[PDB]
Structure formats: C-alpha cells, structure tokens
Design an enzyme around this catalytic site. Structure first.
Site, mmCIF file in Angstrom:
data_model
loop_
_atom_site.group_PDB
_atom_site.id
_atom_site.type_symbol
_atom_site.label_atom_id
_atom_site.label_comp_id
_atom_site.label_asym_id
_atom_site.label_seq_id
_atom_site.Cartn_x
_atom_site.Cartn_y
_atom_site.Cartn_z
ATOM 1 N N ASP A 100 0.862 -1.172 0.000
ATOM 2 C CA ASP A 100 0.000 0.000 0.000
ATOM 3 C C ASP A 100 0.894 1.215 0.000
ATOM 4 O OD1 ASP A 100 0.873 0.494 2.594
ATOM 5 O OD2 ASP A 100 -1.064 0.526 3.629
ATOM 6 N N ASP A 102 1.139 5.003 2.063
ATOM 7 C CA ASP A 102 0.655 5.705 3.260
ATOM 8 C C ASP A 102 1.011 7.181 3.183
ATOM 9 O OD1 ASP A 102 0.038 3.180 4.795
ATOM 10 O OD2 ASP A 102 2.205 2.901 4.305
ATOM 11 N N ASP A 153 -3.540 4.538 2.379
ATOM 12 C CA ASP A 153 -3.954 5.011 3.681
ATOM 13 C C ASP A 153 -3.745 6.518 3.733
ATOM 14 O OD1 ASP A 153 -4.685 2.481 4.458
ATOM 15 O OD2 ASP A 153 -2.806 2.056 5.533
HETATM 16 N N1 LIG Z 1 2.994 -7.614 0.627
HETATM 17 C C1 LIG Z 1 1.759 -7.752 1.139
HETATM 18 N N2 LIG Z 1 1.522 -7.376 2.392
HETATM 19 C C2 LIG Z 1 0.242 -7.573 2.751
HETATM 20 C C3 LIG Z 1 -0.788 -8.094 1.996
HETATM 21 N N3 LIG Z 1 -1.974 -8.128 2.730
HETATM 22 C C4 LIG Z 1 -1.666 -7.636 3.912
HETATM 23 O O1 LIG Z 1 -2.433 -7.513 4.821
HETATM 24 N N4 LIG Z 1 -0.307 -7.284 3.987
HETATM 25 C C5 LIG Z 1 0.336 -6.659 5.249
HETATM 26 O O2 LIG Z 1 1.017 -5.463 4.878
HETATM 27 C C6 LIG Z 1 1.863 -5.018 5.993
HETATM 28 C C7 LIG Z 1 3.132 -4.382 5.502
HETATM 29 O O3 LIG Z 1 2.938 -3.746 4.265
HETATM 30 P P1 LIG Z 1 3.721 -2.431 3.771
HETATM 31 O O4 LIG Z 1 4.648 -2.858 2.651
HETATM 32 O O5 LIG Z 1 2.676 -1.349 3.555
HETATM 33 O O6 LIG Z 1 4.629 -1.978 5.038
HETATM 34 P P2 LIG Z 1 4.463 -0.717 6.051
HETATM 35 O O7 LIG Z 1 5.585 -0.772 7.051
HETATM 36 O O8 LIG Z 1 4.012 0.598 5.403
HETATM 37 O O9 LIG Z 1 3.189 -1.280 6.814
HETATM 38 P P3 LIG Z 1 1.837 -0.452 6.897
HETATM 39 O O10 LIG Z 1 1.405 0.226 5.564
HETATM 40 O O11 LIG Z 1 0.884 -1.529 7.373
HETATM 41 O O12 LIG Z 1 2.150 0.511 8.014
HETATM 42 C C8 LIG Z 1 2.111 -6.274 6.846
HETATM 43 O O13 LIG Z 1 1.656 -6.154 8.211
HETATM 44 C C9 LIG Z 1 1.395 -7.409 6.055
HETATM 45 O O14 LIG Z 1 0.767 -8.247 6.994
HETATM 46 C C10 LIG Z 1 -0.520 -8.488 0.658
HETATM 47 O O15 LIG Z 1 -1.307 -8.982 -0.156
HETATM 48 N N5 LIG Z 1 0.809 -8.286 0.297
HETATM 49 MN MN LIG Z 2 2.396 0.770 4.022
#
Ligand SMILES: Nc1nc2c([nH]c(=O)n2[C@@H]2O[C@H](COP(=O)(O)OP(=O)(O)OP(=O)(O)O)[C@@H](O)[C@H]2O)c(=O)[nH]1
Ligand SMILES: [Mn+2]
Ligand SMILES: [Mn+2]
Ligand SMILES: [Mn+2]
Ligand SMILES: [Mn+2]
Ligand SMILES: [Mn+2]
Ligand SMILES: [Mn+2]
Ligand code: NA
Length: 326
Positions: free
Chosen positions: A193, A195, A250
């Site tokens: 995603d 953010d 987000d």
């Molecule tokens: N790569 C991937 N992550 C997923 C999927 N579905 C899903 O819930 N996730 C969750 O995505 C989170 C991390 O994604 P991210 O690349 O956005 O990392 P981030 O540190 O910004 O996390 P955040 O956006 O949740 O704060 C993990 O907690 C993982 O459980 C999916 O289909 N692919």
């Molecule tokens: Mn993220």
DNA sequence: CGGCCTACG
DNA sequence: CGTA
DNA sequence: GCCG
C-alpha cells in the site's frame, strides 16, 4: 545488543535473511493460533538477527543475544546444521498455515475471521466468493480487488498517487501538505500500500479536511472503496497506460501540533513502533501514541517539533527512518 | 507469576 | 471485529 | 517464548 528494537539501527538490507524469515514463519503461525506473546518473541528474535553486522554461521554467535532462548536457538541451530528446520517446514506445508495466510492477507479479514472460516471448512478465495452473505463490505472490496492488491506497489505508483493526493488536498485546503510515510519513507522499493500523512501549518485549519479530500478524489473517479473522520483506508483506481489497477492507500490527517508523533507512528516499522511504545511506558513511564507523548503523573503532553525531539525526550539515540526496519 | 502498542472506523 |  |  540492546533488548528493545528502538535502541538499535535496523537497515533494510541485512545479513541473516534466511534465519529471520524462518523465525517470522513461526511468529506468523503463533499469531494464527492466537498466541500474541509467542508471536512477539519470534518477531523480536528475528529482528535481533536483522541488526547484527555479519552473518551468523555458528550457534556460538547467539550467546547472550536478547530474545534467544531454547526454542529460537534450536531453530537457528537446525538451519545452520541442515539448511532446514523441521518445525518450520511442517508449518509451511500445513493446510492450516497456508489457508490462514491466504485469508488474512485479504483486506478486511484478520485472524479471528479467518479462523472461523477455516473451522467452517472454507479453504479458497472461490469458497468465500460463493458465500457473499458472510462478508462485510470491506471484505467484499478486499476480495474483489484481491489480484491487484497482491501485486507489489512500486515507486512509479507512489509518485503518481502522491501527485493526485496533493492535487485533491490543495483543492480542499490551500497550504495543506502531503507527506509520504510507511515503508516507502523507510526506503522500501515495494509495498502492499501507500501511506500519506496530511496536515496544515495553522493549527485547526485541518478540521474536516479528510471528507473534503475524499469527495474530491471520488469525483475524479479515483476511489474504488472507502469507509467525521481522520483516517481513511482506501482502495484507489490508479490509472495505468491504457487501463488501471487497484491500489491500497492510507490517508491520515493530523493537526500540526501532532505531526511529529503521527509521522513517527506511521513511518513504522510495525515492530519498531510497538517496541518504542513499550520502551516509553515500561522504561520511561511515559505514554506514546500517534497523537502525543503523555506524562501521566504531571498530566502534561510533551511539545515536540520533530521526530528527533521525541527520541531525545525518551533518552534514545535518534534513528532515521531507513534504520527503523525492525 | 503475568505482560506483551495503541488508537481510530 | 477491522485497519494490521 | 521470553523476560522483568
Ligand atoms: N505484501 C503484502 N503485504 C500484505 C498483503 N496483505 C496484507 O495484509 N499485507 C500486510 O502489509 C503489511 C506491511 O505492508 P507495507 O509494505 O505497507 O509496510 P508498512 O511498514 O508501510 O506497513 P503499513 O502500511 O501496514 O504501516 C504487513 O503487516 C502485512 O501483513 C498483501 O497482499 N501483500
Ligand atoms: Mn504501508
Ligand atoms: Mn541436527
Ligand atoms: Mn504494516
Ligand atoms: Mn484524533
Ligand atoms: Mn505465565
Ligand atoms: Mn507462554
Ligand atoms: Na487482512
């Protein structure tokens, strides 16, 4: 090696990926079985290995490391001796692990929902689509767009999305700003995603902003799913050459007084932030969230102008976002 | 022995 | 519960 | 599962 992940730099690229990935399988499986404590230990142990300067090649090199006890050490020992850990392979290959992973990766589905469906006999995404009354609107959207949401989001996508979010935000409130947060701010090249954190330099002007932004995006045809509010977990219809793809986005609005706390919280990593909040409360007696840092005895909030200010007030060496990859 | 991050939607 |  |  410090015991809390917020006390040590953890880069994006590190030297023990094989060991950490195995411990993270056990953490994920512990979560699927409802043990958040075991999940946390295995996550913490994995992150200790990410912070080490060199590859672990001998069991000796684990001695004294925090969060390595008999169980995590035995997993590393088996991987070093044999290249595989029997427990990890058994979990990997299990129908329960595979199905719980499949279901919990759907937007709108967590462990408790996935476990109920597993216990009812469901095993595939087509099984869920065949029973649509079982689904919230959020889950319907996650299932409808599941293929696109499983495609890594790239930097090209981030740049395009930031431009359309900036345009909507500027139309909704002159002077408002958009800051990329999440994994991309920590240096990741891919994500699940994108953010964004939105504020305005004049305290109070951001009141009511997020509905205005969402209306402007929705009327440009950019919104596939959303739902006074200050956080929106959306799915965008992102244009591509000749077509489009769904992307999770987000959006968060914060008043500028809270912007350092929101920036810190939303930049992650998830483990880094839970460790930082644990550290704040348990070591410093202060309560940290994405809105502020509260001293419960004096009943006052710390006025921070930057993330650096927050680290300093907690007695921690500052870590830039690229070193928060715990 | 009990704790394990913390809100908002 | 979900966001996770 | 590990630790205070
Ligand atoms: N790569 C991937 N992550 C997923 C999927 N579905 C899903 O819930 N996730 C969750 O995505 C989170 C991390 O994604 P991210 O690349 O956005 O990392 P981030 O540190 O910004 O996390 P955040 O956006 O949740 O704060 C993990 O907690 C993982 O459980 C999916 O289909 N692919
Ligand atoms: Mn993220
Ligand atoms: Mn052996
Ligand atoms: Mn995340
Ligand atoms: Mn608020
Ligand atoms: Mn106990
Ligand atoms: Mn236990
Ligand atoms: Na999910």
């Amino acid at each position: 090696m410090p015991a809390y992940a917020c006390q040590r730099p953890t880069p994006l690229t590190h030297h023990n990926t094989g060991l950490s990935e195995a411990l993270e399988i056990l953490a994920e499986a512990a979560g699927f079985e409802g043990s958040e404590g075991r999940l946390l230990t295995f996550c913490r142990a994995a992150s200790v290995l990410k912070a080490l300067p060199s590859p672990v090649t001998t069991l000796s090199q684990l001695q004294g490391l925090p969060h390595f006890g008999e169980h995590s050490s035995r997993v590393v020992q088996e991987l070093l001796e044999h290249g595989v850990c029997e427990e990890v392979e058994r979990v990997r290959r299990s129908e329960r692990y595979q199905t719980m992973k499949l279901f919990t990766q759907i937007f709108g589905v967590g462990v408790k929902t996935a476990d109920r469906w597993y216990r009812e006999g469901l095993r595939t995404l087509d099984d869920l689509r065949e029973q649509p009354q079982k689904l919230t609107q959020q889950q319907k959207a996650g299932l409808q767009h599941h293929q696109d949401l499983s495609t890594p989001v790239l930097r090209s996508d981030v740049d395009a999305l930031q431009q359309v979010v900036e345009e909507a935000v500027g139309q909704a409130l002159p002077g408002a700003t958009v800051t990329l947060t999440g994994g991309f701010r920590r240096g990741k090249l891919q994500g699940h995603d994108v953010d964004f954190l939105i504020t305005h330099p004049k305290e109070g002007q951001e009141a009511g902003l997020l509905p205005r932004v969402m209306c402007r995006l929705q009327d440009q045809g950019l919104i596939l799913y959303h739902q006074a509010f200050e956080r929106s977990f959306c799915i965008f219809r992102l244009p591509q050459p000749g077509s489009w793809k769904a992307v999770r986005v987000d959006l968060v609005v914060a008043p500028v007084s809270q912007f350092p706390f929101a920036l810190l919280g939303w930049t992650g990593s998830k483990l880094f932030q839970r460790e930082l909040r644990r550290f704040s409360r348990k070591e410093k007696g202060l309560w940290l969230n994405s809105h502020g840092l509260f001293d419960p005895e004096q009943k006052t909030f710390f006025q921070a102008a930057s993330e650096e200010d927050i680290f300093r007030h907690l007695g921690l060496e500052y870590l830039p976002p690229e070193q928060r990859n715990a």
